[PDB]
Coordinates of C-alpha atoms and ligand atoms in Angstrom, one line a residue:
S1 CA 85.0 120.9 103.4
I2 CA 87.1 121.0 100.4
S3 CA 88.2 124.5 99.7
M4 CA 86.4 126.4 97.1
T5 CA 89.8 127.5 96.1
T6 CA 91.2 123.6 95.6
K7 CA 88.0 122.8 93.6
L8 CA 88.2 125.7 91.0
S9 CA 92.0 124.9 90.9
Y10 CA 91.5 121.5 90.2
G11 CA 88.9 122.6 87.5
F12 CA 91.2 124.8 85.9
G13 CA 94.0 122.1 85.9
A14 CA 91.6 119.6 84.2
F15 CA 90.7 122.4 81.6
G16 CA 94.0 123.0 80.5
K17 CA 95.0 119.2 80.7
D18 CA 92.0 118.2 78.2
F19 CA 92.5 121.5 76.4
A20 CA 95.7 120.1 75.1
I21 CA 94.5 116.8 73.9
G22 CA 91.2 118.1 72.4
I23 CA 92.9 119.3 69.1
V24 CA 94.7 115.8 68.8
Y25 CA 91.6 113.6 69.4
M26 CA 89.5 115.8 67.2
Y27 CA 91.6 116.9 64.4
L28 CA 94.9 115.2 64.0
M29 CA 93.6 112.8 61.4
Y30 CA 92.4 115.8 59.4
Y31 CA 95.8 117.2 59.9
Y32 CA 97.6 114.5 58.7
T33 CA 95.6 113.5 55.9
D34 CA 94.6 116.9 54.7
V35 CA 97.8 119.0 55.5
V36 CA 100.6 116.6 55.5
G37 CA 99.3 113.9 52.9
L38 CA 99.6 110.4 54.6
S39 CA 97.8 107.2 53.5
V40 CA 94.6 106.9 55.7
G41 CA 96.1 103.1 56.1
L42 CA 99.3 104.4 57.6
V43 CA 97.4 106.9 59.9
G44 CA 95.0 104.1 61.1
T45 CA 97.6 101.5 61.8
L46 CA 99.7 104.0 63.7
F47 CA 96.8 105.3 65.6
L48 CA 95.9 101.4 66.6
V49 CA 99.4 100.6 67.4
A50 CA 100.3 103.6 69.3
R51 CA 96.9 103.0 71.3
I52 CA 97.8 99.6 72.5
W53 CA 101.3 100.7 73.1
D54 CA 100.0 103.5 75.3
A55 CA 97.7 100.9 77.1
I56 CA 100.7 98.8 77.8
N57 CA 102.7 101.8 79.0
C58 CA 99.9 102.9 81.7
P59 CA 100.6 100.3 84.4
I60 CA 104.4 101.0 83.8
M61 CA 103.6 104.6 84.7
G62 CA 101.5 103.6 87.8
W63 CA 104.5 101.7 89.1
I64 CA 106.7 104.9 88.4
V65 CA 104.3 107.1 90.0
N66 CA 104.2 105.1 93.0
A67 CA 107.9 104.5 93.4
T68 CA 109.0 108.3 93.2
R69 CA 109.8 109.8 96.4
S70 CA 110.5 113.6 96.0
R71 CA 110.0 116.9 97.7
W72 CA 106.9 118.0 95.9
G73 CA 105.1 114.7 96.3
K74 CA 105.0 111.5 94.3
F75 CA 102.5 112.9 91.7
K76 CA 103.1 116.6 91.4
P77 CA 106.9 116.1 90.0
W78 CA 105.5 113.6 87.5
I79 CA 102.5 116.0 86.5
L80 CA 104.9 119.1 85.8
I81 CA 107.1 116.7 83.8
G82 CA 104.3 115.3 81.8
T83 CA 102.7 118.4 80.9
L84 CA 106.0 120.4 79.9
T85 CA 107.4 117.3 77.8
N86 CA 103.8 116.8 76.5
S87 CA 103.6 120.4 75.1
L88 CA 106.8 120.3 73.4
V89 CA 105.9 117.1 72.0
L90 CA 102.8 118.5 70.9
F91 CA 104.4 121.4 69.3
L92 CA 106.6 118.8 67.2
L93 CA 103.7 116.7 66.5
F94 CA 102.0 119.6 64.7
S95 CA 105.1 120.7 63.1
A96 CA 105.2 117.8 60.6
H97 CA 104.2 119.5 57.7
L98 CA 107.7 120.8 57.5
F99 CA 109.6 117.4 56.5
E100 CA 108.9 115.4 53.6
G101 CA 109.3 111.6 52.6
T102 CA 110.5 109.0 54.9
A103 CA 111.9 111.7 56.8
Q104 CA 108.2 113.2 57.4
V105 CA 106.8 109.5 57.9
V106 CA 109.5 108.8 60.8
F107 CA 108.8 112.2 62.4
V108 CA 105.1 111.8 62.5
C109 CA 105.4 108.3 64.2
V110 CA 107.7 109.3 66.6
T111 CA 106.1 112.4 67.5
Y112 CA 102.8 110.6 67.9
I113 CA 103.8 107.8 70.1
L114 CA 105.8 110.4 72.0
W115 CA 102.9 112.6 72.7
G116 CA 100.8 109.4 73.8
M117 CA 103.5 108.3 76.3
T118 CA 104.1 111.8 77.5
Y119 CA 100.3 112.3 77.9
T120 CA 100.2 109.3 80.1
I121 CA 103.0 110.4 82.4
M122 CA 100.7 113.3 83.5
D123 CA 97.4 112.0 83.2
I124 CA 97.8 108.9 85.8
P125 CA 99.2 111.1 88.6
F126 CA 96.9 114.2 87.7
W127 CA 93.6 112.5 88.3
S128 CA 95.4 110.3 91.3
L129 CA 94.9 113.5 93.4
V130 CA 91.3 113.2 94.0
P131 CA 91.6 110.1 96.4
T132 CA 93.9 112.1 98.2
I133 CA 92.1 115.4 98.2
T134 CA 89.4 113.8 100.3
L135 CA 87.9 110.4 101.0
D136 CA 84.2 111.4 101.7
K137 CA 81.3 110.1 99.8
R138 CA 79.6 113.8 99.2
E139 CA 83.0 115.7 99.1
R140 CA 84.0 113.6 96.3
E141 CA 80.6 113.6 94.5
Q142 CA 80.9 117.4 94.6
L143 CA 84.5 117.6 93.8
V144 CA 84.9 115.5 90.8
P145 CA 82.2 117.5 88.7
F146 CA 84.4 120.6 88.7
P147 CA 87.4 119.0 86.5
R148 CA 84.9 117.0 84.6
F149 CA 82.9 120.0 83.7
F150 CA 86.0 122.0 82.7
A151 CA 87.4 119.0 80.8
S152 CA 84.3 118.6 78.6
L153 CA 84.2 122.6 78.3
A154 CA 87.8 122.5 76.9
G155 CA 86.8 119.7 74.4
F156 CA 83.7 121.6 73.5
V157 CA 85.5 125.0 73.0
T158 CA 88.2 123.1 71.1
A159 CA 85.6 121.8 68.7
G160 CA 84.0 125.1 68.3
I161 CA 86.8 127.4 67.7
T162 CA 89.8 125.5 66.7
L163 CA 89.0 125.7 63.0
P164 CA 88.4 129.4 63.0
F165 CA 91.7 130.1 64.6
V166 CA 93.8 128.1 61.9
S167 CA 91.7 130.0 59.6
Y168 CA 92.6 133.7 60.6
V169 CA 96.2 132.7 61.3
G170 CA 97.8 132.1 58.0
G171 CA 94.6 130.9 56.1
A172 CA 97.0 129.6 53.3
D173 CA 99.3 127.3 55.2
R174 CA 97.1 125.1 57.5
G175 CA 100.1 123.5 59.1
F176 CA 101.3 127.2 60.4
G177 CA 97.9 127.7 61.9
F178 CA 97.8 124.5 63.7
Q179 CA 101.3 124.5 65.2
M180 CA 100.5 128.3 66.1
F181 CA 97.0 127.5 67.8
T182 CA 99.4 124.9 69.7
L183 CA 100.8 127.9 71.3
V184 CA 97.7 129.1 72.8
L185 CA 97.0 125.4 74.0
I186 CA 100.2 125.1 75.4
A187 CA 100.0 128.5 77.5
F188 CA 96.8 127.2 78.9
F189 CA 98.2 123.8 79.7
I190 CA 101.2 125.1 81.5
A191 CA 99.3 128.0 83.3
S192 CA 96.7 125.2 84.5
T193 CA 99.5 123.0 85.4
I194 CA 101.1 125.6 87.7
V195 CA 97.9 126.6 88.9
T196 CA 96.7 122.9 90.2
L197 CA 100.2 122.3 91.3
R198 CA 100.2 125.5 93.8
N199 CA 96.6 125.0 94.9
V200 CA 95.8 121.4 95.1
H201 CA 97.2 120.1 98.5
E202 CA 97.0 116.2 98.6
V203 CA 95.8 115.3 102.2
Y204 CA 95.6 111.6 102.3
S205 CA 98.6 110.7 100.0
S206 CA 100.4 107.7 99.8
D207 CA 103.6 109.3 100.7
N208 CA 102.4 110.5 103.9
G209 CA 103.3 109.2 107.3
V210 CA 100.1 107.5 108.4
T211 CA 99.2 106.1 105.0
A212 CA 99.3 102.3 104.2
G213 CA 101.3 102.8 101.2
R214 CA 104.8 101.0 100.3
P215 CA 106.6 103.1 97.9
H216 CA 109.0 99.8 97.4
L217 CA 106.9 97.5 95.2
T218 CA 107.6 95.5 92.0
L219 CA 105.9 95.7 88.8
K220 CA 104.2 92.1 89.1
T221 CA 103.1 93.0 93.1
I222 CA 101.3 96.1 91.6
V223 CA 100.0 94.7 88.6
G224 CA 98.4 91.7 90.5
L225 CA 97.2 94.3 92.9
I226 CA 94.4 95.0 90.3
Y227 CA 93.1 91.3 90.3
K228 CA 93.4 91.0 94.1
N229 CA 91.5 94.2 94.5
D230 CA 88.3 92.5 93.0
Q231 CA 86.6 96.0 93.2
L232 CA 89.1 97.5 90.9
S233 CA 88.9 94.6 88.3
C234 CA 85.2 94.9 88.4
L235 CA 85.7 98.6 87.5
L236 CA 88.3 97.8 85.0
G237 CA 86.0 95.3 83.1
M238 CA 82.8 98.1 83.7
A239 CA 85.0 100.9 82.2
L240 CA 86.3 98.9 79.2
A241 CA 82.7 97.9 78.2
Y242 CA 81.5 101.3 78.5
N243 CA 84.4 102.7 76.4
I244 CA 84.2 100.2 73.9
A245 CA 80.4 101.3 73.4
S246 CA 80.9 104.7 73.5
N247 CA 83.8 104.4 70.8
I248 CA 81.7 102.3 68.6
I249 CA 78.8 104.9 68.9
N250 CA 81.1 108.1 68.3
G251 CA 82.6 106.4 65.2
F252 CA 79.1 105.6 64.0
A253 CA 78.5 109.4 64.6
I254 CA 81.7 110.7 62.9
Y255 CA 81.1 108.2 59.9
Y256 CA 77.3 109.2 59.8
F257 CA 78.2 113.1 59.7
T258 CA 81.5 113.3 57.8
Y259 CA 80.9 110.8 54.7
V260 CA 77.1 111.5 55.0
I261 CA 76.9 115.2 55.8
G262 CA 73.4 114.2 57.4
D263 CA 72.5 117.5 56.6
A264 CA 74.5 120.5 55.6
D265 CA 74.8 122.5 59.2
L266 CA 73.5 119.8 61.3
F267 CA 76.5 118.8 63.1
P268 CA 77.0 122.6 64.5
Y269 CA 73.5 122.4 66.3
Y270 CA 74.2 118.7 67.2
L271 CA 77.4 119.5 69.0
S272 CA 75.8 122.7 70.6
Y273 CA 73.1 120.7 71.9
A274 CA 75.4 117.8 73.0
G275 CA 77.8 120.2 75.0
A276 CA 74.9 122.2 76.5
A277 CA 73.6 118.7 77.7
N278 CA 76.8 117.4 79.1
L279 CA 77.8 120.6 80.7
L280 CA 74.4 121.1 82.4
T281 CA 74.6 117.4 83.5
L282 CA 77.7 118.1 85.1
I283 CA 76.7 121.2 86.6
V284 CA 73.5 119.5 88.4
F285 CA 75.4 116.3 89.5
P286 CA 75.9 117.3 93.1
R287 CA 71.9 117.5 93.4
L288 CA 71.3 114.4 91.3
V289 CA 73.6 112.1 93.2
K290 CA 71.7 112.9 96.4
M291 CA 68.2 113.4 94.6
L292 CA 68.6 110.0 93.3
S293 CA 70.8 106.8 94.0
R294 CA 74.6 106.6 92.9
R295 CA 73.5 103.1 91.5
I296 CA 70.4 104.6 89.9
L297 CA 72.7 107.4 88.6
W298 CA 75.0 104.6 87.1
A299 CA 71.9 102.9 85.4
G300 CA 71.1 106.1 83.9
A301 CA 74.6 106.6 82.6
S302 CA 74.5 103.1 80.9
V303 CA 70.8 103.3 79.7
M304 CA 70.6 106.9 78.2
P305 CA 72.7 106.0 75.5
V306 CA 71.2 102.9 74.8
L307 CA 67.9 104.8 74.5
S308 CA 69.8 106.9 71.9
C309 CA 70.9 103.6 70.2
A310 CA 67.2 102.4 70.1
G311 CA 66.0 105.5 68.6
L312 CA 68.7 106.0 66.1
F313 CA 67.9 102.0 65.2
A314 CA 64.2 102.9 64.7
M315 CA 65.7 105.6 62.4
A316 CA 67.8 103.5 60.5
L317 CA 64.8 101.1 59.8
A318 CA 62.8 103.7 57.8
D319 CA 63.9 107.4 58.3
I320 CA 67.3 107.8 56.8
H321 CA 67.5 111.2 58.8
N322 CA 65.7 112.9 61.3
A323 CA 67.2 116.1 63.0
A324 CA 65.4 116.1 66.0
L325 CA 66.3 112.5 66.7
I326 CA 69.8 113.1 65.8
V327 CA 70.1 115.8 68.5
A328 CA 67.9 113.8 70.7
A329 CA 70.3 110.7 70.9
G330 CA 73.5 112.9 71.0
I331 CA 71.6 114.6 73.9
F332 CA 71.1 111.2 75.6
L333 CA 74.8 110.1 74.8
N334 CA 76.1 113.0 76.2
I335 CA 74.2 112.8 79.5
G336 CA 75.3 109.2 79.9
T337 CA 79.0 109.8 79.2
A338 CA 78.7 112.8 81.5
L339 CA 77.3 110.7 84.5
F340 CA 79.8 107.9 83.7
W341 CA 83.0 109.9 84.0
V342 CA 81.7 111.6 87.1
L343 CA 81.0 108.3 88.6
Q344 CA 84.0 106.7 87.3
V345 CA 86.5 109.1 88.9
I346 CA 84.5 108.9 92.1
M347 CA 84.7 105.1 92.0
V348 CA 88.2 104.8 91.3
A349 CA 88.8 107.1 94.4
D350 CA 86.7 104.5 96.3
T351 CA 88.5 101.6 95.0
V352 CA 91.9 102.9 96.1
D353 CA 89.9 103.3 99.5
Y354 CA 88.6 100.0 99.3
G355 CA 92.3 98.5 98.3
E356 CA 93.6 100.3 101.5
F357 CA 90.9 98.8 103.3
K358 CA 91.3 95.1 102.2
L359 CA 94.9 94.5 101.0
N360 CA 96.4 97.2 103.4
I361 CA 97.8 99.0 100.5
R362 CA 97.2 102.5 99.3
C363 CA 98.0 102.8 95.7
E364 CA 96.2 105.5 93.6
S365 CA 98.5 105.7 90.6
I366 CA 97.4 102.0 90.0
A367 CA 93.8 102.7 90.0
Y368 CA 94.2 105.8 87.8
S369 CA 96.7 103.7 85.3
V370 CA 93.7 101.1 85.1
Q371 CA 91.3 104.1 84.0
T372 CA 93.7 105.4 81.4
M373 CA 94.9 101.9 80.2
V374 CA 91.2 101.1 79.8
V375 CA 90.4 104.5 78.0
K376 CA 92.9 103.5 75.3
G377 CA 92.1 99.8 75.1
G378 CA 88.4 100.9 74.7
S379 CA 89.3 102.3 71.4
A380 CA 91.7 99.2 70.5
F381 CA 89.0 97.0 71.4
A382 CA 86.3 98.9 69.6
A383 CA 88.2 98.9 66.6
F384 CA 89.1 95.1 66.9
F385 CA 85.4 94.3 67.2
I386 CA 84.3 96.3 64.2
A387 CA 87.1 94.7 62.1
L388 CA 85.7 91.4 63.4
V389 CA 82.2 92.1 62.6
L390 CA 83.4 93.9 58.9
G391 CA 85.3 90.4 58.0
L392 CA 82.4 88.3 59.5
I393 CA 79.7 90.4 57.1
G394 CA 81.9 90.4 54.2
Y395 CA 83.0 94.0 54.2
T396 CA 86.9 92.6 54.1
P397 CA 87.4 93.9 50.7
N398 CA 86.0 97.2 50.9
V399 CA 85.3 97.7 47.2
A400 CA 81.7 97.2 46.5
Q401 CA 78.9 95.7 48.8
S402 CA 75.2 95.2 48.8
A403 CA 72.9 97.9 49.9
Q404 CA 71.3 95.3 52.5
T405 CA 74.8 94.4 53.6
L406 CA 75.4 97.9 54.4
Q407 CA 72.0 98.0 56.4
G408 CA 72.8 95.0 58.3
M409 CA 76.1 96.4 59.0
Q410 CA 74.6 99.5 60.6
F411 CA 72.2 97.3 62.3
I412 CA 75.1 95.4 64.0
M413 CA 76.8 98.7 64.8
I414 CA 73.8 99.9 66.5
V415 CA 73.4 96.8 68.3
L416 CA 76.9 96.0 69.9
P417 CA 77.1 99.1 72.0
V418 CA 73.9 98.1 73.5
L419 CA 75.2 94.5 74.4
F420 CA 78.4 96.5 75.8
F421 CA 76.0 98.9 77.9
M422 CA 74.3 96.1 79.3
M423 CA 77.6 94.2 80.1
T424 CA 78.9 97.1 82.1
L425 CA 75.7 97.7 84.0
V426 CA 75.3 93.8 84.8
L427 CA 78.6 93.6 85.9
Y428 CA 77.9 96.7 88.0
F429 CA 74.9 95.4 89.7
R430 CA 76.2 92.1 90.2
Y431 CA 79.7 92.5 91.4
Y432 CA 80.5 96.3 92.6
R433 CA 79.8 96.7 96.5
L434 CA 81.4 100.2 96.9
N435 CA 78.0 102.2 97.6
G436 CA 76.3 103.2 100.8
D437 CA 77.3 101.3 104.2
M438 CA 80.2 99.8 102.6
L439 CA 81.7 103.2 101.6
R440 CA 81.0 104.5 105.1
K441 CA 82.9 101.2 106.5
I442 CA 85.8 101.7 104.5
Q443 CA 86.0 105.6 105.2
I444 CA 85.7 104.8 108.9
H445 CA 88.2 102.3 109.0
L446 CA 90.8 104.3 106.9
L447 CA 90.3 107.3 109.2
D448 CA 90.5 105.4 112.6
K449 CA 93.4 103.5 111.3
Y450 CA 95.2 107.0 110.5
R451 CA 96.5 107.1 113.9
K452 CA 100.5 106.7 113.3
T453 CA 102.7 104.7 115.4
Ligands
LMO501 C1 83.0 116.6 70.3 C2 82.3 115.2 69.9 C3 81.1 114.9 70.6 C4 81.5 115.0 72.2 C5 83.0 114.1 72.4 C6 82.8 112.5 71.7 C7 82.4 111.5 72.3 C8 82.8 110.8 73.7 C9 83.4 109.4 73.0 C10 84.8 108.9 73.8 C11 84.6 108.9 75.6 C12 85.6 108.8 76.3 O1 86.1 109.7 77.1 C13 86.4 111.0 76.5 O2 88.0 110.9 76.2 C14 88.5 112.1 75.6 C15 90.2 111.7 76.1 O3 90.3 112.6 77.4 C16 89.7 111.8 78.5 O4 90.7 110.8 78.6 C17 92.0 111.0 79.0 C18 92.5 109.6 79.5 O5 93.6 109.4 78.5 C19 92.1 112.0 80.1 O6 91.7 111.5 81.3 C20 91.1 112.9 80.0 O7 90.9 113.8 81.2 C21 89.6 112.5 79.7 O8 88.8 113.7 79.2 C22 88.0 113.6 75.9 O9 88.3 114.3 74.8 C23 86.5 113.6 76.2 O10 86.2 114.7 76.7 C24 86.1 112.4 77.3 O11 84.6 112.1 77.1

């Protein structure tokens, strides 16, 4: 079985990994708009362009990771490089409050696009380690929950005690407190990197002797291996749909909690219950995946946020606000997202296995590049579709609109995520085949095939 040591070390690695990007994801807009003083249009355009650039960069990083040959491995060197460079670029990212004028703008833009690329560097090869740690069904099912739980916990501890830190350390200067807390983030991040590098021992890697990998591959060949691997392209589409839906819902939540307070002091309780639900469902996944089916857990992952959307739709109809319904929708969404992420990591591992099985090529970096680029492109496409719907409904001026227009806009914003969720689950139940007998066939084929020359 997987070493408990390796399980917990991968967990801590994921914790430090997502403890460095939680601050960014959650408060970089607040820093740039409330500490630096930059127009919201600039920040939005930069964020969108940077997410597009990162999505395009992802496959390039996958090609790089597969082609690299080195002593530590083909993942660990890039993991280390990315961790260190991203820590540095993060510190620079939050040191933007120093400059002013065009200098400040250029600094912000450069540091942001860097931070993005740098995080890609290590994000792809990091998650590329689960397929090489093991290729068994239950072993993966009880391996992935550890890093997913630790990542969620990092995000939630950020959400919780990121502001108190910045307040206690130089309360007058918010930028100083930000760049100081960045030091705590960097310390945890580098410690976790060292832990995972020392303890995680890739077993079925693409750079070992018996694997079916080919380090000398072109960018065209690799990126086309996504379409040739029908299951990987199916996962691409499914994850894209789910990410677009989750992004639209999370944006609705941010707009309904920030602009409209919803109710003073509601967000702490909502976040507490959401984190509790997410962490619990991640803890009890190793038992749920067996009590229920993997297919049924995916169905639930896509249906629970749909039930949340329906609840808050019924709410929007009459009840402008019901704290109970709010936190219930939050709990449902969080359970769905936890299930989705765990199953998605396990499934990208299964897809690299199936690619070795069909195309006779083992390439984990490309599957996880697909994962990361889909994460970025989910936000990208959610923004695109929201702008499209706003222009269609007549919100393109953004100066003054009808109350009925706003109500219809809310209704459309609630309905579209449901469309994307039903898309992801129909695609799953109509195209995906890597469950049950198929998985064991692939596993046995690979194991028996691992009998070197
Ligand atoms: C606090 C407010 C309520 C709860 C959270 C908001 C609702 C989720 C809406 C987007 C779901 C896409 O997924 C998330 O994406 C983030 C980036 O990191 C993710 O994406 C990266 C890829 O760029 C890395 O893989 C990283 O490990 C992975 O967690 C992580 O912060 C989250 O935890 C992870 O759920």
